[PDB]
Amino acid sequence: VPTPNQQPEVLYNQIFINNEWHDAVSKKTFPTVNPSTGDVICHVAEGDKADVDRAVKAARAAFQLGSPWRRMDASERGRLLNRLADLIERDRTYLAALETLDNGKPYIISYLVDLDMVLKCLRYYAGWADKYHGKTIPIDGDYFSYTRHEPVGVCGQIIPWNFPLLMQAWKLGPALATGNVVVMKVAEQTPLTALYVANLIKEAGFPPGVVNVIPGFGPTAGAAIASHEDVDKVAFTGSTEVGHLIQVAAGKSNLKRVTLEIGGKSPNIIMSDADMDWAVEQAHFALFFNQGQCCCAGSRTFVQEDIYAEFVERSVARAKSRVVGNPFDSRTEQGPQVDETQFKKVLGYIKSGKEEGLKLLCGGGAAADRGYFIQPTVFGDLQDGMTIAKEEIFGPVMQILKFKSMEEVVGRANNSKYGLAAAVFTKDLDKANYLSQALQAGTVWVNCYDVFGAQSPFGGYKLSGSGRELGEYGLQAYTEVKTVTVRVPQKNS
Amino acid sequence: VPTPNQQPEVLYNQIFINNEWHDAVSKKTFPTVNPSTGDVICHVAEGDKADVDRAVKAARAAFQLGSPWRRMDASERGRLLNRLADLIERDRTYLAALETLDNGKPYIISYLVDLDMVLKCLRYYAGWADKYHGKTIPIDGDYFSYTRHEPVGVCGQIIPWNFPLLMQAWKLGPALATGNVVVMKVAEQTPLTALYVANLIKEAGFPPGVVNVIPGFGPTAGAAIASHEDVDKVAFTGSTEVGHLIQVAAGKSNLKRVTLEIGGKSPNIIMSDADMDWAVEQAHFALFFNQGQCCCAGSRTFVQEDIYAEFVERSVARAKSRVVGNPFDSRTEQGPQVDETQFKKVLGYIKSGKEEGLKLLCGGGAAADRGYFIQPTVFGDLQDGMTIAKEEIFGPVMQILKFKSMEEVVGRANNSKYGLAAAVFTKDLDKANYLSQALQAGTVWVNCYDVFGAQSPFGGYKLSGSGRELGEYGLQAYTEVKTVTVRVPQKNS
Amino acid sequence: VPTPNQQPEVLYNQIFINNEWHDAVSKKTFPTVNPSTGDVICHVAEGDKADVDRAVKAARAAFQLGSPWRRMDASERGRLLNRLADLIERDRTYLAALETLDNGKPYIISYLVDLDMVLKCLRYYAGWADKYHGKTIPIDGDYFSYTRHEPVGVCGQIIPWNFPLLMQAWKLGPALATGNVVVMKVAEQTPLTALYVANLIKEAGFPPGVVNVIPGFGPTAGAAIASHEDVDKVAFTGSTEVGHLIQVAAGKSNLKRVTLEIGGKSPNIIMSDADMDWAVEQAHFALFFNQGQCCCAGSRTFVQEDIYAEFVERSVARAKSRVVGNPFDSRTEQGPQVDETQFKKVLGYIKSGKEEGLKLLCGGGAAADRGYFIQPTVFGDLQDGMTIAKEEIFGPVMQILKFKSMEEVVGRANNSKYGLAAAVFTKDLDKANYLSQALQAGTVWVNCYDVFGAQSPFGGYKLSGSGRELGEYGLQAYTEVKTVTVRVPQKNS
């Protein structure tokens, strides 16, 4: 991994509309902070409804029948998505460092994980551009019926701050591959990298208006997109709380298509026959990954009684060794929580757990006096009714529950409003299969966790979402089907 | 066509839950009227939230992992759907007669069109039960990734009164084929036929709880389903106005999946090289079909100037010959409008058109003093800004507009909030191709209209809906994808 | 199971062409024998090239563009396939008894297994008729490219005698569902049942010429189809030896499409962790099923040393209790071998095994002096180089080999020219996964054997075939793709 620049230059910090950078109509700006220090990195333009409106107009124009983007070859769309990937790889070290600076996650991770996954995502959807065929349908009568899978139109895409570059990639990949136009609202906590990529979009040769990126706040620029009378589809990734708002906004207005990838409280079921060493390390990763700031985190580790104590002993030991520190330090495994708000938020949960009567196995407190660092906390002997066993903590706080039978664990694991993911650690074939099928989750990892693939769909089962976001499934939400039934002289098979 | 019984006996008039008939919790009932006479056919149980809740519980139970329906083989689901089809065909004369008595549409149509389309739909989806495969995905790393296309859960389906039996079949086919459970709310204006088929479902051998039919009112039983914390998905077909409500209800509550098949103001573009005889008859059919009570009706007939006068003269002549009368009379082409409220509503539009300054070419008034009959009205020389040229009349009121160029007609045709369908009559290949691609509609009929096929998707492009309802596409909304990524010792191609 | 008629009346015994029964052009006939007695059931007309040519002519005519069959709705094709299934079910008792009478297999099997699987197959493909869509392709340039999945043409289908009715159904289902015409050659050992179904085809309402069934001999009628200048595609199921002949014939002549489903030597790998009770019973079933006359039979039972002795002991015990007798007796598990030729052939193999130096664990000799009955033989301590461990015996002769490691078993199991199927019995997830992927077989059963599903494909990996025969895959070989690229004034997404 290339040596990063612990202070990457911030080259772009405005609103990107029509391959041009401009300030907010109000000239307002908001600060972005480096979570590791608490110092302001720079000031980004504060987009609002006016800027959203301007962007939507730009996007609508770019989507007009006969525009370069509409007329462009599907193959060339894939070409552009690949060119974008190339530029991103060219600037891999810069983007990784900027990501870590803006987000807090370990540089090594931003580089080897995030950027790799961004590249693999864009490159994956570049190949889908000219392969998402429609169908010729054998209708009754003397007709020739077929379907056109055309773009849904102007797509509003709102993303969170946990995986800035990646969440952007997840949205842009299928949207652009299907020939859609975009008006994206990036998280105010981490806007720096998306803006840089926005410029790479221009450099890649994307037609003006195709991708519009607007930095700003939620109920401001985000809501402006959600209830816009000219945004055809909205893709939202964030809190379940805001998810409700997004959906309600669509109903009250444009009646635009909605897809939501939201919160979770994923159960991590460990059976007695599970390989301990593996089950332990993966259980650690499943929850602490990305400062515990992951939607599909295994927030409820259900360990079978026969191995509970042992597992617990090992989980605590691993949490005890987990190195928290400067994101840029090669040996730092845990960086700071994205921001103070999230910092105090997490601590509030640690407080709740202790108060509701939980076995605090690892120190639940700040790890430093400067950045927003929190100690890898592990709570033992959890009860389903406890807040920390119900609510998404989104911080390095592990919950370890004990179960006896599978009949029992299935019911318990499924007893949640969330249903984004789950995992099963077992050596037995039948137990793996039975559980996979019984768990009401968008993704069930067997003998592993957090395994993401551009080719495999991701999504929620209940209040954790609707619609899938990767693979061929990711193209569906970005397609408007058109049936054309033509009368023919005489139909034949 | 078998001679019907002008007065079919109403055998079922209660709430169907768990293969059993019960009265409403409140014991309240509401009358159902025969639009041809204005007399009450009988009184149906008035379902409300309480009944909806009891139906949802029955549905949830039927969906329980390990229940007969869950464990049932996909093939047997197809068997049950076919069995249902057979029983419906067995009772074809009865159901067509009852349909006509409760709805108003001509008996010949109920029999040859509706009932035929009902059978073709169910029989089509019976074949999909065991064929909607999931996928094995070539993911990166040593894993085995695949997807499970599982049922979405408890499906709430709300249908209108224009095609009672058909709208029900449109909903039940894909829902049942995919292994889902149903809580259906039937239109208060025409509940009788749905209830009969409800019992046929029991007789077919469908497990109790799988399909629950609730007769009642909209803001009552309908809203109860839309905002239910235990209904996983809602499928709505009705007005765009109510559609907003359905979507907002979902966001404020369960965040359930939503699909909307709503209103329209479909344009019927007639080019000068169109075969007159055909273009005229089909343009007549396009708007007057089913008492003009059709979502995708060609409510805006744009005739190219070069043939405008001639076309209009023939349109009016055709309207003048259109026989309005007793739906049971074999020569009756037009029955009465579903109910007085719709009656008064249609006349209100004829009034608007006149006042807005339109060429009333065919008498716009009642056609009788008994039932709810209205004269096949034809308005000529319409202007896009006129209400009747903007709003969905849903009655036998034809609007004929004139255009010069295609560039112009494309823009005008597309100038609408709706986008459910459209059609183009031409002998020219390039004009057919160009327009079909240019019209923002879920269905574009070329040289025909109202051609529906169980195998071809149907849906709206803007405020006319979201999601498709037929063909393979009709299965999507009823599927919940599950990605199972299993770690393997060593992956190989 | 309905009490059969020990002596079913043979109603049809000629050549079926154009919904009509006629004798062979030569008026020749050949006898069909009841293997349980050795007595002639009746005499069937002997078709040859002359009759095949007449049939092909009939088929070609029925395939003419504009014929009722070509113009027929895809849904109607499905309707006809369903009608055929219904009639077959109506005559289930008769067909089962006739099957047993002419084949030898136990009546209970013919009824509960064969006939059920025939119904399930036809019913499955009925649903495929109107669902095998083509595609609209997003080609570069101003074009509208799409594909038509049309019938391949005149299909010659040659079947074996092991599962008469079933093999017929496997061929007819996909052929007719895709709109093709048929020229079928039925096994001279068991032509009776196929002929009866042939007439049910007529009764179902199938257009004349669409399905032509020709009873006769191999190098006679079979070869006549194989090298016919007007047969578009040949589907063969038989011996690997004849398979070579069929493909060579195609290349020599019409260059028609070829698919072969041939012989096997399927390995059954039982690992130490396997549940004995089940592994032993399924291992018994995997080999002895249908008088050991099954292409995918587990002809090489590789038992892991740690449980070899124990396993063998039980295999033998089960072999010893295996009831061989009158197919019509409820207690009969094993009927006679199809015919004398196969009887002597099987005995030859038992002879071989003994001479090759094998542990004869169960008597390898005739079980009666009347019909063609053979004692369920079990050979222990087999060596890969032994003929009985190499060649397809096709009789109740069990081979039990011993293995130590997976690495070793994989290589050994794969060391065969055949590759039709394999099975793995384990409780371990990783072993199941690893083996499934490592075994070069068209079907790998895990913890079960001979599990067939109309929805899952079946086929060979090497000298055991080419192409798949069930599920959606079974439609491929019966489809001819046509790309239509039309010039459009202006292409848009």
Next chain:
Amino acid sequence: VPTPNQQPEVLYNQIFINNEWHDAVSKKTFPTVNPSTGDVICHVAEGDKADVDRAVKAARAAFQLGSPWRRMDASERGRLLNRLADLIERDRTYLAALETLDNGKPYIISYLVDLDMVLKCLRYYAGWADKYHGKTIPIDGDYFSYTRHEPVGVCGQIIPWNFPLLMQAWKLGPALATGNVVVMKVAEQTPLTALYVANLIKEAGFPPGVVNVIPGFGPTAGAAIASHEDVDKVAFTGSTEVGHLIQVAAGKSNLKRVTLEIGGKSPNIIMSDADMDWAVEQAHFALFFNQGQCCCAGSRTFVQEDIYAEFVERSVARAKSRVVGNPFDSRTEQGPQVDETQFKKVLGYIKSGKEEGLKLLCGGGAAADRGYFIQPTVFGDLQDGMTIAKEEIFGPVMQILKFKSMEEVVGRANNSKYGLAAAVFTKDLDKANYLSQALQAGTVWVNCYDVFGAQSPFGGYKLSGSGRELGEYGLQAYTEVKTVTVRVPQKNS
């Protein structure tokens, strides 16, 4: 178009096996000639059975389970294909020049057409690598059935000389995208470019043994692959004559999978309402393109009598202006015929036509005394029974036939053993629709010709082939389906 090097350096002229260049086992070589001069470009190694065997071994090893290639991620396969495309583009000018030097086609065409199509094809299939999913099948009973789309194995691919680089790309694209290994036999008349790309494969980072290129002769190296006991599948593109041989070879040997892309005699139907200017130029292109050396050339131009005379007059004038000359001259439209053998072969046909009694409208003779140049010949008033109207000329010799009705032209156009392509020029929608469905051709071009797209399949209907070569269809032939049915404790929907 960059100025080429009229004498590009030949850097590679040996056999490529294991990313290494070696001479033939016999040390024999054969000359490769420049058709424009008749002078020898250089000497290439003459591969034979021995070298094929060597290559097969290399490929077999590269395909071993656990190999870098077998273990490689499908995405990485796509990455390698894209890497190869980049290297090919990097050397576009060199490759174009070398292609022209060894083939004879105009440099401008090699550059803007051939190389462009080469890049487009490879880049297209790069995207397929991780997208050709298998499926999870809803089988009956307590099982989990799914399919694995695995590589077929060692693929032998034999290509002709008309589009050297492109034919290679058509084979390599799907083969490599699906994870297969290759043993390719390149045309003795034009081996130079394939060999250079062979080295670029090495440079791209492809594992050794994955692609082996062998220059040599047909009945020698070609047949050695066709009848190899270890080549799992053979893909052939060449003459129908040799096609028979290839298929026969497969049947006599390994029983390997076969796909043939062979000769044609495509009809070009021009209706009276066809735009003359366009129909005339397209008709010219359709036959003369690539020195008339194109499999799907419109060698039977059926002009509707009403426009016959006029069309012919225009066709002749066009042929009369067609510039034949030095392939490297910007003004050259027609280069020399690949080789003397083909040169005399074409002249033989011109002699035939004259003798058969045809209207020689344009000089049917050599165009120069140096290279292999032939004058753009046009024969008028052709009769279906004439040799030149039946046999593939494969040179610049146009056949113009006259027809009266559609019914007539359909039957005539279809009266051929070939069925590779066809075209229809009409302004009428119904005529276009009717004919497209009526013509038995793998591709029917409407108002255009020779329009190829990596996304749309190409193939023959009769003696012109079997199987398709582009789009998703191109992956089918390179996939081996494996059904894995696992027993599960309890199956649920």
